[PDB]
Design a protein around this nucleic acid. Sequence first.
DNA 1: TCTCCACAGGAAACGGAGGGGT
DNA 2: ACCCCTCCGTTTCCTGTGGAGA
Length: 382
Amino acid sequence: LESKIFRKRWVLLPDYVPDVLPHREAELRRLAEVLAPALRGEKPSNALLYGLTGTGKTAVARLVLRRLEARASSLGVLVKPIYVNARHRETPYRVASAIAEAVGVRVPFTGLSVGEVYERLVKRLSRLRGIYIIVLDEIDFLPKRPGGQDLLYRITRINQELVSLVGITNSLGFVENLEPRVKSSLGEVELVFPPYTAPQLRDILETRAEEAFNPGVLDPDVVPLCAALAAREHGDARRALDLLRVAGEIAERRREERVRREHVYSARAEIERDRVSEVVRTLPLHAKLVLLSIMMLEDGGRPASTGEIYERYKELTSTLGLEHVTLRRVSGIISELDMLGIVKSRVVSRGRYGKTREVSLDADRLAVENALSEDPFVARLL
DNA sequence: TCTCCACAGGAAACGGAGGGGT
DNA sequence: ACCCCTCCGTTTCCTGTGGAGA
Ligand SMILES: Nc1ncnc2c1ncn2[C@@H]1O[C@H](COP(=O)(O)OP(=O)(O)O)[C@@H](O)[C@H]1O
Ligand SMILES: [Mg+2]
C-alpha cells in the first residue's frame, strides 16, 4: 500500500526524532559534552534550555538521550534516561506520577498527595542502583500552578536523598518565575536555542525530504516556500514540516506524482481549519456560548466589548433556560479564547467611558460555525 | 489636574465527583 | 470508617488603570 508520493510519511510525523539535525549541531554537541561523563563518569551537571517553539529543543535532547542509551547499552554501565512532558500531561501531580512510573511504580491516577507520590519515587529509586537523567520538557507549565515551584525544587534536590535534570521550556520569561534558588540548578548549563533563518528551515526540510519523499516528486522550491511561511513569524520547523507534509498528504488526495506550490497553500488552509475545529469542539459549554456571542456581535465591525459579550451571553443562556456564569469568568473565558488564538483581543480605554476589551474573531468564521453546531446546545441557537 | 467609569486580571477557594492509605 | 487527596470550571474579593469629562 505504497505511494509514489511518500516513501516514509512517518519520518515526517511529529515523533520521529531524526539522527542528523542540521544547524543545531552545537546545541547537540554541548548537551552531549554535558551528559557523556555519566558514561565513564558520573553525575552530570544539571541543565536547562530556554527557546521558542519549533527551534528543535525537544528534537535534540531526545536524540542525545537516544545516543546516551545506545552507548550505555553497549558498555553495560546502567544509565537510565527518562523523558517527561509537562505540557501534554499538565499538572504537578502527574509530572511526578509519570517520572515515578518510568522507574517502575503504580499509577494511582488520583489518590495522592504530590508528596506521597514523590516519596514513592525516591524509594524504588533509592532501592535500585544506577545514575538516571530526568528530562522535564516544558516545565514552565509546572510553576504555572501550585506545588509547581515546590516540586521543581524537590526534584533538583532529589540527588541527595542519597541524579540529573534537563529542564526545557520556551520563554526567557522563566529565568524569572524561578525562585533564584530553583533557577540556580534547574540550569547549571544555559542551553539556548536561537531560532531559524529561512535558508535554515530550507536546509532542514531538504534533509527530512530525502528521508520521507520519493526522489523527484517534491517540486523545486516548494521547500523554500514552506520556510517562507514558517519564517514569516518566528522560525518554527514543526510548522515548516507540518506544512510540507500536509502538502504531500493533500497531493495523494488529488492523485498526482508531484507536490507543488498549490498543495502547500491548501495545506495552510487544512491545518487552521482542523486546529480551529479541534478547539471549538473541545470547549466547555459556556465557553462555547461566549464564542457565539462574539460571533454575533462582530457582525458588522463594531468589535465586541467585554461588556456587550456578557449581556447577549446572558441572552443566549436564558434563550436555552440555563444558569449563567459570572462576568469575571466570561472575561476569563475571553482571555482563554484569545490564547487559543481562536479570537484576538485589544485592551483599550474609552476615556471617562471606562476600560474594556475590543474582542474580534481571528479564526475562520465558518470553521468555528460547523464546530459550534456539533454541540447540540449551541446548535439550537441556529 | 483631579474623577471615576468599565472593566482587567491576580488570589483564593469552592463543590461535588474522580479517588487514596491506614 | 476516618480524613485525606486531586480536578476543573467556576465564585468571591480584590486591586489597578487610560483617559473623557467636569
Ligand atoms: N535542526 C533540525 N533538523 C531537523 N528537524 C528538526 C530540527 N529542529 C526541529 N526539527 C523538527 O521540527 C519539529 C519541531 O522541533 P522540536 O525540536 O520538537 O521543537 P521544540 O523546540 O518545541 O522542541 C520536530 O518534529 C523535529 O523533527
Ligand atoms: Mg517541544
